[PDB]
């Protein structure tokens, strides 16, 4: 791709004409764009769309989308991928053997790496400014850094041994991360640690960071299992990360390399320009849902994140790039072409 | 086991209100549903269904199908399963041993034991009013069942060295049953013979019997996917039917249980009191397309015959939960709890 196509709102609804893609309302065209050109098209809340835009869309390969406020994925439409029993098959049999455990820990590693990423900047930029929270930044980086220390040591035959001692020891990482963001987080916004979560329960989000948090891990999640299919792996056979809860476990497990580099930094981005405030939370329930105006912007940001350009390995590539790149690295390690490595940034 | 509602047409679009499904066309109302009553939804052609509609199905566990006016799948929703990869192992593991090749002969077997089943039916009917087409319909039951007994015999220990053989034998009994069939449709119709079905690149139809079979086809391979999904199956890691195309190999390979008594007697059915007829055809592009009634007649006469029931297996069954019943059948098999037998009532 290829350009990410928006539909949202009452009343809008998305059809073809004359071999393009369009967006209407009220039977009045609003916008227009060739089908060659899309990567992927979203269809959220109110927004419809006709099964010959359907068509036209999987005709080229157009990855379809649809989604509510929360930015939770009701489904996806795609070209159905061929040839993946091999790939398959030895990704049901790392799972008894090591390869599974070094994929796991790789993973973990990433995550720990770019938590600690994330707190090395964030301490370089309060170095004279606000010296305490520096300190506090560097020293939440080094018990980080020891629990990096700590896993690395960690070896089994199989990952079904290890898998809660991994979590753990991720978790008290991710425990030291998220106390540590807390010192950067302006008081009005009432952020008092991850309550969003996944890993324990489904708490949904009281504060405007969890919430803004909770919406980019789910638009990235769709892009990791985008990612994960596209390489001809199962999606629902993951090696770290799996439960009954029925989501797609390698999707997640590929996150851990992306979650603070794509989600995390553009959140702390508009935090920082007060660019989503505290009152632009909506109560639903006891949640606090993003107000509509929050949502474009979060979810534009976030969009416009993925596709930005990086340095890794000597190319410059967007981040969706190197989501897929590490796919294809999964399974070039599964079919034991070449060792499985964690992203790693620093920026 | 709930509704199925269908779709279709420009101006139509899915929306919800108070917790109903609505079809809805210039802003005003035209059909409202419960959920809970609902099973699936289909959205065909220029209809249209938003996020939230979506959304509400969804949570009711109503599957939701997108399909173009030819009635080819394009895509279909449901809750999420767990979980299937034990299943989906054993079925890349079993394309490697005999197992793929019991399957594949069940299910050329139950092809032909159907095909035979029809022919049965219509000889019977013919016994006395046309004495002669009986005979011909019963000798090429004959033929079939000469080519069954060839394949009772052919053995391997995977499906890769004996599927051409597979499908000749299968070929030729196809052959004899659909001259057969021909002898049965009325001249005007001309039905020469079969075309166009997914087993090989496509041969799109010039006549209205083979665009009614390659619409029902369709349609039962869309209950198909949906079946073999549900059961936590690989659709496009099937074993009989491999293909270049990336077509759904596994659905097409179950569909070999049904598409005789499912879509064959409907379209029969519909022959034979001239519901459809010759002139029901409409040129687009090259090909006989169905006109829009000849089409909803059609649809609605599938998945009516798709929620009839029968007798199967010491119990009263709608032929769609038999299809569901035999894709579970094959995850049993893959699991060594049950060998696979071929769909057959009669």
């Given at each position: 791709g290829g350009m990410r196509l928006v539909v949202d709102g009452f009343g809008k609804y998305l059809g073809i004409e004359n071999g393009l893609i369009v967006v209407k309302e009220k039977g009045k065209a609003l916008r227009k764009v060739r089908p060659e050109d899309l990567k992927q098209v979203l269809i959220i809340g109110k927004a419809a769309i006709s099964s010959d835009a359907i068509k036209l869309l999987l005709k080229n390969?157009?990855?379809?989308?649809?989604?509510?406020?929360?930015?939770?994925?009701?489904?996806?439409?795609?070209?159905?991928?061929?040839?993946?029993?091999?790939?398959?098959?030895?990704?049901?049999?790392?799972?008894?053997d090591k390869r599974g455990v070094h994929l796991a820990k790789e993973f973990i590693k990433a995550k720990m790496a770019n938590q600690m990423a994330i707190l090395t900047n964030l301490a370089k930029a309060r170095k004279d400014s606000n010296p305490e929270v520096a300190e506090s930044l560097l020293k939440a980086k080094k018990e980080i850094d020891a629990c990096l220390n700590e896993l690395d040591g960690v070896e089994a035959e199989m990952i079904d041994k290890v898998r809660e001692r991994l979590l753990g020891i991720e978790g008290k990482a991710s425990k030291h991360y998220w106390d540590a963001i807390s010192l950067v987080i302006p008081e009005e916004?009432?952020?008092?640690?991850?309550?969003?979560?996944?890993?324990?329960?489904?708490?949904?989000?009281?504060?405007?960071?969890?919430?803004?948090?909770?919406?980019?891990?789910?638009i990235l999640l769709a892009e990791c299992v985008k990612a994960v299919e596209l390489a001809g792996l199962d999606p629902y056979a993951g090696f770290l990360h799996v439960d009954?809860?029925?989501?797609?476990?390698?999707?997640?497990?590929?996150?851990?390399?992306?979650?603070?580099?794509?989600?995390?930094?553009?959140v702390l981005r508009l935090i920082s320009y007060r660019q989503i405030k505290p009152e632009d939370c909506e109560k639903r329930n006891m949640v606090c849902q993003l107000s509509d105006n929050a949502r474009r912007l979060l979810l534009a940001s976030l969009l416009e994140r993925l596709d930005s350009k990086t340095q890794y390995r000597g190319r410059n590539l967007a981040y969706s790039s190197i989501i897929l790149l590490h796919a294809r690295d999964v399974v070039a390690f599964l079919r034991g072409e070449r060792r499985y490595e964690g992203f790693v940034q620093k920026w």
């Open positions: 390969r157009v990855d379809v989308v649809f989604l509510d406020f929360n930015g939770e994925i009701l489904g996806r439409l795609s070209h159905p991928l061929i040839g993946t029993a091999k790939t398959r098959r030895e990704q049901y049999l790392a799972y008894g916004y009432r952020f008092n640690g991850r309550r969003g979560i996944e890993i324990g329960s489904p708490r949904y989000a009281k504060d405007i960071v969890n919430a803004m948090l909770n919406y980019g891990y789910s009954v809860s029925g989501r797609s476990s390698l999707a997640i497990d590929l996150m851990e390399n992306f979650r603070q580099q794509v989600v995390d930094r553009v």
